[PDB]
Amino acid sequence: KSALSAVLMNRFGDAFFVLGLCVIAYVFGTLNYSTIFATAYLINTDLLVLIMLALFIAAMAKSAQFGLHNWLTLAMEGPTPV
Amino acid sequence: FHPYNTLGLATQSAMVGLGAGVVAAAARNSLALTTFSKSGGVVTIFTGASIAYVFTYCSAANLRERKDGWNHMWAGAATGAVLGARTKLVPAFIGWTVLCGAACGLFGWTGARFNADRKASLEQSPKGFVQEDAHQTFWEVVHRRPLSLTVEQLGEGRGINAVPIATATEAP
Amino acid sequence: PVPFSAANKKLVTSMYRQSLKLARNWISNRQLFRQKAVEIRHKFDQNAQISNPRLLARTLDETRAHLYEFRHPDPIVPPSFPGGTKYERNVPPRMEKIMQHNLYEP
Amino acid sequence: KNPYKKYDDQQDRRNLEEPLSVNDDLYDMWSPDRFTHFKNQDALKYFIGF
Amino acid sequence: ELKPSSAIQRGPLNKGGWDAPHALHNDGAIDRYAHWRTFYQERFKYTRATGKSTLIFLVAFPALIGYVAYQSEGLFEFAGKRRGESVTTR
Amino acid sequence: LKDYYYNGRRILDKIPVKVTWEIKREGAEKEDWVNQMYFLYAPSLILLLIVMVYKS
Amino acid sequence: ILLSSLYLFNRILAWQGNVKHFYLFASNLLLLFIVVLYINFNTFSNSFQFNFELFNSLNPFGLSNSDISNGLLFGIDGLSLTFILLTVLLIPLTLLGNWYNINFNSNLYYTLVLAIGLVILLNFWALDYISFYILFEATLPLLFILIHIYGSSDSERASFYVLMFTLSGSLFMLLSIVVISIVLNTTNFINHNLFVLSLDLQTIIWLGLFIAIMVKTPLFPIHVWLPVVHSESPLAGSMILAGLILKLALYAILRLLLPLLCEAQILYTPMIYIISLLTIILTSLATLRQIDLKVIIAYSSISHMGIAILGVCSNTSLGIYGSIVLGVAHGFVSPALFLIVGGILYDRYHIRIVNYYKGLTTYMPQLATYIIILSFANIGTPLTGNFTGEFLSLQGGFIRNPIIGGISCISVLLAAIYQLKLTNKLTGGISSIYMHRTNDVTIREKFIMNILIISTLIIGICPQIMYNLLYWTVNNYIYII
Amino acid sequence: GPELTPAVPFFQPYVLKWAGVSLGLVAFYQFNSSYEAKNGHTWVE
Ligand SMILES: CCCCCCCCCCC(CCCCCCCCCC)(CO[C@H]1O[C@@H](CO)[C@H](O[C@@H]2O[C@@H](CO)[C@H](O)[C@@H](O)[C@@H]2O)[C@@H](O)[C@@H]1O)CO[C@H]1O[C@@H](CO)[C@H](O[C@@H]2O[C@@H](CO)[C@H](O)[C@@H](O)[C@@H]2O)[C@@H](O)[C@H]1O
Ligand SMILES: CCCCCCCCCCCCCCCCCC(=O)OC[C@H](COP(=O)(O)OCCN)OC(=O)CCCCCCCCCCCCCCCCC
């Protein structure tokens, strides 16, 4: 049950990450770091806010911020080295 | 669009429905003063269906100032409401309403006729490829349509533009 | 509601057990837990001889309310038991023979 | 269901031929965990208050 | 006097095959629960709750999505939009 | 013959070779589907992959 | 040849008594033949290549070289070639997955299975509306008979569903096809984008075509037949139905609808997006409260088809490529899951209720590994073709309509929920008390599942390997002025 | 010292099959690339 909780919450983060990937590909035409960082400063700020909100929701799930954190304390069901 | 006279047409429909219910009652009697006692309310069935359909149809047509299948959809909804009130159950009432409305809306969409409108039909219409620069009629086909017609019908955006992109973005 | 019966016995012994488990769960310090246990003992001792039905029923109800007021979010449970963290961990397999399901294929 | 009674399937705390509620899948062991300490409404009050 | 031909010899339909040992211990309660859930459509009735879920999911939700999808058609263009520029076309 | 072979092999856990019913189940077992599949279907998928890679 | 080969078939039947070896051999030959065709297929051309015509009046029983073409047309381009390769890959596995569990009228069963496979394969070759429709309906009698005779307990209702729902949609498809026939007097797919019908007529024809697509894909709200038909079908029926017959719908959109009714499609696209978002969200949620294994696997396919549709009507090259790749990956993965639930577990225990199953890892670790791999593949793990398809489809959908596509990105989560909720209970816990120990997955079952897994992995790590066949197609259907 | 379960050969049938196929495919790829470099077109083309 703890494993299911963790995988599902991180899949929530991943759904928002996929939303972010779609918008990045549409807006910049690519996923490479070099191009995105080369042409970031010229992009409309609403689009950047959309991208960054999606990616931040993903990282929030991953980094167990208070929105998506319950799995963090269920994960100690696994072995201590894990 | 000039109006239907809702009051008059509904009155004639009341008369027709009453007569039809009378005929159905006489038949019902013959097949089974008791004719109306053992009628099963068929006179009321006919009268109510007639008044509901005609009144709602004319009402809707006058209010929307249009003549199309939607008026028949409303009228079928009213007729189904009348016929499903006889069940005395809310689910059945709703089902009669929506389904009779849908069936009559389909009927009105196809032309509100059981036989065909011969002059509008494909067999009696200009068909095939059109000539030099003629306007497209319903059954005719071309090899290329005018871009202004596309922009007006479909609407601007979503890749629909007045000018092809490559032409518009050409440098000089 | 008997003043002294086997069912009364079982009920009050269970409640007294409970009270003690609650006290252990609530108090981290051992010495302090000891004084809480002895106070709980004295409090049960005092009301031991109640006889009339109304007063005994009221006292039992009130003590149930007290225990419910002082229930702990997470009781201490050893690892190998239902609430425990070892529970069902590496459950040894049931030793079994394979039943076949198909004449041609294992 | 207290876990010290014996059951035919101890992990699911079910005995054989026990009748199943129509909404059983919401009440078995695999169902989302329920917590008894605070009432649901009360826990909502605390969460929103914090 | 009307009887099938005596010429016909009828035997049993046997399906053959190897009767495997029965590897599942059927639980009657589970089977009844499964049958009830499987044929729930035969017993469905329109009530206040059931009608409420019907009118939500088959009517209200489609209407919401339709309003969104027809209101927003062609509204956005994002490819390479820069600062100060409108991401909206209308 | 099929029936006798497989019924014995299933209700004895013994193979009908070697001639009285030995237990030597390690090897000498070939199912009938394996020749066709392994020697035609698998090469065909390998060929498809090669062709796609080189048509790319 | 045909006379001699018929003699060979007859003799093999008389001596061996079970046709199934001959059918397996035949299907493998067909696969090899299609691969030879792929070798000789020119990819630097957007023209149909291996053309032939049947039932022409000058030569009713042969091929036609006449200057008047009144027969049925067949031929392939890259788009048809992709699905044909998928079909010939899947057919022998469909034969093999029932190699031992059919012990009665087995010859008839294998005949029906191979006939259905051949019908679908030929359907992909069709080049005009009438032959497409003919081969599109020809499966329904075979599916009806197969499901009725070789199905599980509730198979009669299943057979009636699979016939009736598909007929219901197909007849409205027939209305649209009849309108096209009488308006254009042509039916071919070769030059049907050259005819520009009036917008109103396009809007009317589109309705019949899309009603057929709703029933066959399926899409919400007329999807309720599929879970039944799947659960009571025998394994071959379920594998074929999930892996090919649904992709027939997507191929139908691309081939019949988009080139002819472009402007009407542009008008109707938001309605399509409403229906696809409905099917994704609502069927994914409804999957949570199912108690049958095969029913849950069936419900998964509908959601993946919803994502496919969102991709294919996106009016972008990426969306179409994603829809195709997702179709192929689904044709790899879903037959594998159906193999598990309806051929391994069902043939060992003859039950499909979820409550009975638990903790299968202890006795059958290999089956548990297969379940884990296939489930993470089904929910769209990268380096699997399913992920590429869902990602590209979602890109196209987000471009076509940012709000609707953004909301559709919830499919990743929803798919994870139902699939992992299933596999959690199946793999772990203490071994069930209701069932006893049985054999682990055998060599045949492992062979089939390995084929499907390696196929999906190969196209998941390098989805580009399909591009040589599809780079014309990704431009042949998008409508930008 | 931990206990010792029975011996098992390193190279199983599946090891042989999968390793042989994969290595043969890589060798075939390299052979085609080299045969391209010399003949000016790959042996498969
Ligand atoms: C897959 C779902 C199936 C369900 C949908 C099918 C319903 C079809 C509706 C479409 C359609 C037939 C199209 C058939 C095409 C193939 C048939 C498809 C398969 C058949 C199953 C029926 O159109 C009907 O629509 C009804 C309203 O809903 C009207 O109802 C009635 O309204 C009131 C009376 O005036 C009354 O008050 C009452 O009698 C009803 O209220 C009918 O009068 C009307 O005929 C339209 O046909 C007609 O359209 C017009 C202009 O379009 C065409 O002429 C055009 O003239 C100029 C402008 O006029 C244009 O400049 C010119 O270019 C063009 O020449 C015609 O040539 C003709 O073709
Ligand atoms: C019952 C449902 C309704 C039935 C409607 C239709 C029934 C049709 C019956 C099946 C017959 C079709 C298959 C054989 C026709 C093709 C024969 C042929 O020779 O191919 C012609 C084509 C061009 O050849 P050619 O111009 O002569 O040049 C040769 C150069 N060396 O050469 C080629 O390019 C090769 C073409 C390969 C075609 C692959 C076909 C895939 C499946 C083959 C068998 C399908 C049988 C279906 C049985 C179920 C019924 C659908």
Side-chain angles (χ1 to χ4, degrees):
Chain A
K1 295 177 70 67
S2 290
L4 184 67
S5 167
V7 75
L8 290 185
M9 266 175 213
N10 289 321
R11 183 60 61 91
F12 183 104
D14 291 331
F16 275 89
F17 194 30
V18 168
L19 161 63
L21 296 158
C22 292
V23 62
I24 295 163
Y26 181 22
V27 167
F28 288 90
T30 179
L31 294 180
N32 297 350
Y33 289 147
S34 282
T35 43
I36 297 169
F37 304 158
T39 62
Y41 62 108
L42 309 156
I43 297 302
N44 175 273
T45 52
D46 170 18
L47 304 186
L48 299 189
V49 165
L50 188 153
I51 290 178
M52 209 52 256
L53 266 290
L55 310 190
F56 167 66
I57 294 296
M60 189 203 211
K62 185 62 71 173
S63 285
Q65 313 302 20
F66 207 63
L68 299 171
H69 63 269
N70 301 117
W71 70 271
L72 183 44
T73 62
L74 302 187
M76 284 74 74
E77 191 55 59
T80 298
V82 173
Chain B
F1 174 89
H2 71 287
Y4 288 87
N5 290 318
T6 317
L7 62 87
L9 281 295
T11 55
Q12 287 70 241
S13 179
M15 170 196 100
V16 183
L18 259 186
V22 163
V23 168
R28 277 289 280 288
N29 188 359
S30 282
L31 281 82
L33 294 173
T34 187
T35 183
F36 302 141
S37 176
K38 301 292 180 63
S39 179
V42 301
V43 294
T44 53
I45 296 175
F46 279 69
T47 315
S50 64
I51 192 66
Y53 182 76
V54 68
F55 185 32
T56 302
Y57 182 76
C58 299
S59 313
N62 296 295
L63 189 143
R64 184 177 179 179
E65 293 90 24
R66 297 180 181 182
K67 285 169 207 218
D68 55 43
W70 290 115
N71 290 318
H72 298 273
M73 183 278 288
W74 299 127
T79 295
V82 172
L83 284 153
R86 320 181 37 80
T87 303
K88 315 272 182 33
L89 294 174
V90 184
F93 171 80
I94 301 299
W96 276 97
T97 303
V98 299
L99 296 173
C100 280
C104 287
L106 181 74
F107 172 69
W109 178 5
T110 53
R113 290 179 71 183
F114 294 102
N115 63 351
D117 190 357
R118 282 260 313 296
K119 67 184 289 184
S121 83
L122 173 63
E123 173 89 346
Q124 315 261 333
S125 296
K127 63 178 72 69
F129 274 112
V130 302
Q131 293 179 336
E132 299 177 352
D133 277 349
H135 199 288
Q136 292 294 61
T137 61
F138 183 86
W139 297 105
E140 280 155 347
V141 70
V142 295
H143 274 149
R144 301 184 78 171
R145 63 158 41 199
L147 195 151
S148 66
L149 170 65
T150 294
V151 163
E152 65 183 1
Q153 292 264 80
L154 295 186
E156 265 291 324
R158 84 201 81 71
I160 295 175
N161 54 5
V163 179
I165 297 91
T167 299
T169 77
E170 202 46 20
Chain C
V2 183
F4 313 93
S5 79
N8 200 29
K9 182 64 69 178
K10 191 178 320 307
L11 188 140
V12 299
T13 62
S14 68
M15 293 177 70
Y16 201 66
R17 277 178 289 178
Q18 201 180 49
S19 69
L20 291 153
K21 264 63 72 173
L22 276 69
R24 204 281 170 281
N25 282 326
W26 274 108
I27 301 299
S28 293
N29 180 281
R30 174 31 71 91
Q31 313 94 30
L32 278 296
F33 163 58
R34 308 310 296 115
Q35 303 82 56
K36 279 73 176 175
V38 298
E39 201 295 339
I40 297 169
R41 177 89 201 180
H42 203 35
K43 194 43 42 193
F44 195 110
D45 284 333
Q46 293 217 291
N47 303 276
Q49 313 295 317
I50 198 74
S51 295
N52 65 324
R54 287 177 288 102
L55 200 40
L56 64 88
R58 294 261 331 281
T59 55
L60 277 296
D61 183 327
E62 190 277 331
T63 55
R64 273 312 212 181
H66 187 231
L67 294 174
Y68 187 90
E69 291 149 18
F70 286 98
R71 59 186 184 86
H72 204 79
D74 55 353
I76 299 168
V77 174
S80 49
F81 294 165
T85 52
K86 205 83 91 173
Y87 193 37
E88 293 179 353
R89 196 151 72 61
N90 290 318
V91 170
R94 214 158 82 248
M95 214 47 81
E96 292 323 319
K97 279 150 276 302
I98 62 170
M99 282 73 74
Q100 312 289 323
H101 71 91
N102 188 257
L103 183 63
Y104 293 99
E105 184 178 1
Chain D
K1 309 187 89 41
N2 291 318
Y4 313 109
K5 277 74 69 177
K6 298 296 186 179
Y7 305 97
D8 289 328
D9 187 76
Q10 189 64 39
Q11 188 173 359
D12 298 330
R13 295 177 196 171
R14 180 197 181 250
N15 272 19
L16 298 202
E17 293 83 4
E18 283 180 347
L20 283 72
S21 162
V22 288
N23 278 328
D24 193 2
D25 68 63
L26 298 169
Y27 297 105
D28 291 331
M29 301 295 327
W30 295 88
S31 183
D33 273 342
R34 292 180 179 91
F35 318 116
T36 186
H37 192 283
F38 295 105
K39 264 183 71 203
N40 297 115
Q41 169 79 318
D42 196 4
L44 172 53
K45 202 194 160 261
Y46 303 170
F47 194 23
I48 189 172
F50 168 94
Chain E
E1 51 158 50
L2 293 151
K3 182 174 72 68
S5 179
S6 308
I8 191 167
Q9 60 271 35
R10 311 280 273 295
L13 188 145
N14 62 4
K15 212 44 180 183
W18 170 68
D19 286 6
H22 176 65
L24 183 63
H25 311 288
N26 284 297
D27 188 284
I30 292 177
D31 309 315
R32 295 179 66 250
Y33 166 74
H35 193 265
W36 189 89
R37 293 288 310 273
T38 287
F39 296 101
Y40 176 96
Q41 66 272 1
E42 271 186 280
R43 323 165 190 95
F44 174 78
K45 293 182 183 293
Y46 283 79
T47 68
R48 183 178 60 80
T50 72
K52 205 99 161 183
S53 68
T54 300
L55 73 86
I56 291 174
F57 297 105
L58 286 198
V59 181
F61 182 76
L64 190 55
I65 298 185
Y67 172 85
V68 175
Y70 284 139
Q71 182 266 341
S72 179
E73 181 205 279
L75 190 41
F76 298 114
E77 184 180 1
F78 292 169
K81 285 305 170 325
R82 299 188 290 83
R83 316 176 86 66
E85 301 305 19
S86 182
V87 297
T88 287
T89 300
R90 52 177 260 282
Chain F
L1 298 182
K2 214 153 181 293
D3 291 331
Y4 280 127
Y5 188 114
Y6 287 116
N7 296 115
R9 184 201 270 221
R10 177 56 72 236
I11 201 169
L12 286 181
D13 189 359
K14 313 297 304 314
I15 192 66
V17 170
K18 276 274 198 162
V19 188
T20 59
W21 286 130
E22 295 302 320
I23 192 67
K24 193 258 173 192
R25 294 298 190 84
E26 190 72 32
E29 299 299 334
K30 187 175 182 178
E31 299 182 355
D32 63 358
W33 65 263
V34 298
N35 54 347
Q36 295 254 38
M37 291 282 81
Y38 268 106
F39 293 96
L40 194 48
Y41 185 61
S44 301
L45 294 182
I46 295 286
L47 174 64
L48 172 59
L49 181 62
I50 290 159
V51 166
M52 296 215 301
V53 176
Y54 278 136
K55 279 290 221 276
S56 65
Chain G
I1 299 169
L2 302 172
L3 287 187
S4 67
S5 60
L6 181 63
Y7 184 50
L8 301 203
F9 176 83
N10 189 179
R11 302 270 45 72
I12 286 156
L13 191 150
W15 281 109
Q16 205 279 347
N18 189 332
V19 294
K20 63 181 186 177
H21 305 94
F22 194 69
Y23 290 173
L24 196 53
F25 179 69
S27 179
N28 290 324
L29 276 296
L30 277 296
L31 196 156
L32 189 147
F33 193 69
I34 301 299
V35 179
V36 168
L37 285 181
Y38 183 24
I39 284 165
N40 293 299
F41 177 90
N42 186 321
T43 65
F44 191 55
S45 164
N46 196 5
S47 283
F48 300 89
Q49 291 185 41
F50 294 88
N51 308 294
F52 59 102
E53 191 146 30
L54 275 299
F55 321 124
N56 183 272
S57 57
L58 287 193
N59 211 8
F61 287 91
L63 312 181
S64 77
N65 57 321
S66 68
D67 283 0
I68 303 296
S69 49
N70 42 45
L72 294 175
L73 265 185
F74 299 99
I76 54 178
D77 63 358
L79 173 61
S80 279
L81 194 45
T82 298
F83 291 116
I84 279 158
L85 291 162
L86 174 80
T87 302
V88 290
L89 191 147
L90 280 188
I91 297 169
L93 303 181
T94 300
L95 287 168
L96 183 63
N98 266 28
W99 196 224
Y100 293 117
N101 49 17
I102 175 67
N103 301 302
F104 54 105
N105 302 341
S106 168
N107 286 342
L108 169 57
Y109 173 90
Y110 284 102
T111 307
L112 295 173
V113 166
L114 175 64
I116 292 162
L118 298 168
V119 168
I120 293 160
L121 167 65
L122 197 50
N123 187 356
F124 280 113
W125 280 77
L127 294 175
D128 61 352
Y129 283 93
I130 297 296
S131 63
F132 185 88
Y133 187 91
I134 285 168
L135 279 47
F136 181 80
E137 319 301 325
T139 54
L140 303 196
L142 306 170
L143 294 174
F144 177 87
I145 291 308
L146 193 159
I147 295 182
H148 195 295
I149 297 174
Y150 303 91
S152 52
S153 57
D154 193 42
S155 85
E156 183 174 353
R157 174 174 83 114
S159 52
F160 271 79
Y161 281 18
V162 68
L163 191 142
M164 291 315 298
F165 275 84
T166 305
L167 279 196
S168 189
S170 302
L171 291 192
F172 293 65
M173 179 164 210
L174 189 64
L175 287 185
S176 287
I177 290 177
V178 164
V179 165
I180 291 161
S181 176
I182 63 178
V183 166
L184 304 176
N185 310 104
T186 47
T187 61
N188 52 21
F189 295 145
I190 312 188
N191 68 350
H192 68 295
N193 56 12
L194 295 177
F195 296 85
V196 181
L197 297 170
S198 82
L199 184 66
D200 297 330
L201 192 59
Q202 277 188 39
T203 289
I204 297 299
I205 299 173
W206 189 100
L207 275 166
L209 287 188
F210 192 60
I211 288 161
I213 298 310
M214 271 191 221
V215 309
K216 204 92 191 86
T217 295
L219 296 178
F220 198 79
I222 54 174
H223 65 289
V224 292
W225 64 272
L226 187 153
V228 184
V229 174
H230 271 286
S231 64
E232 309 63 23
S233 170
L235 173 67
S238 294
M239 291 206 328
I240 295 167
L241 196 156
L244 297 153
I245 300 195
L246 269 72
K247 284 75 181 179
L248 268 178
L250 184 72
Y251 182 71
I253 297 90
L254 284 156
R255 194 41 71 70
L256 281 65
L257 195 151
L258 275 178
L260 183 63
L261 309 160
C262 303
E263 294 89 27
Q265 169 86 343
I266 297 285
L267 262 190
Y268 273 71
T269 296
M271 178 180 166
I272 297 169
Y273 270 23
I274 298 147
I275 282 156
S276 76
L277 187 65
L278 265 291
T279 190
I280 295 162
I281 287 179
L282 264 47
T283 60
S284 282
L285 280 180
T287 316
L288 292 184
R289 297 293 304 276
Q290 316 302 319
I291 66 172
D292 188 313
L293 272 194
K294 223 155 170 206
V295 163
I296 293 176
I297 316 304
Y299 262 102
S300 180
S301 306
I302 296 180
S303 300
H304 287 318
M305 295 296 172
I307 295 282
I309 298 299
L310 190 85
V312 73
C313 305
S314 74
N315 209 38
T316 56
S317 169
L318 287 170
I320 294 161
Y321 195 72
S323 64
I324 299 300
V325 169
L326 189 48
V328 165
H330 184 266
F332 293 141
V333 172
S334 187
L337 286 165
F338 273 112
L339 182 63
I340 282 183
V341 294
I344 294 170
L345 292 185
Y346 180 85
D347 291 331
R348 280 148 175 77
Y349 300 109
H350 312 292
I351 199 78
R352 266 172 269 91
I353 303 316
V354 64
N355 305 67
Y356 284 126
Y357 292 88
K358 206 173 65 55
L360 296 153
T361 316
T362 292
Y363 300 130
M364 271 165 308
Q366 300 194 118
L367 174 61
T369 291
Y370 277 114
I371 284 168
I372 301 299
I373 285 176
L374 287 178
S375 299
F376 275 104
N378 180 296
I379 59 171
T381 297
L383 309 186
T384 62
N386 304 66
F387 164 70
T388 313
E390 69 187 1
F391 178 40
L392 288 190
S393 179
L394 261 173
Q395 285 188 58
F398 166 87
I399 286 172
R400 188 54 179 80
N401 189 293
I403 300 298
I404 290 293
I407 296 170
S408 294
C409 284
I410 197 65
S411 49
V412 176
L413 187 153
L414 297 196
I417 293 176
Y418 54 77
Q419 202 73 89
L420 293 184
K421 181 176 70 68
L422 180 52
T423 67
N424 206 58
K425 181 173 174 71
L426 281 193
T427 54
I430 296 153
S431 316
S432 178
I433 60 174
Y434 305 98
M435 65 184 73
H436 284 234
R437 179 187 183 198
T438 47
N439 291 275
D440 186 74
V441 290
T442 70
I443 305 304
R444 184 199 90 230
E445 302 160 312
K446 263 193 290 302
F447 175 88
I448 294 162
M449 264 176 295
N450 278 349
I451 294 295
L452 302 167
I453 294 176
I454 58 190
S455 309
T456 183
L457 271 294
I458 294 170
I459 68 169
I461 64 161
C462 196
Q464 295 298 109
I465 199 165
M466 325 304 299
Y467 195 38
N468 57 13
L469 288 179
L470 294 174
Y471 69 91
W472 294 118
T473 295
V474 298
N475 221 30
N476 289 168
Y477 307 116
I478 61 172
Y479 190 81
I480 307 280
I481 291 306
Chain H
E3 201 276 340
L4 187 153
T5 62
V8 289
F10 182 76
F11 285 135
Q12 312 264 43
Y14 71 83
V15 176
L16 188 153
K17 285 202 306 318
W18 284 65
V21 175
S22 66
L23 183 63
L25 276 296
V26 192
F28 182 74
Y29 187 90
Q30 296 294 321
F31 181 76
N32 278 294
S33 50
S34 82
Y35 176 110
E36 181 67 27
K38 64 192 61 73
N39 291 63
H41 55 101
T42 74
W43 182 71
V44 66
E45 183 178 1

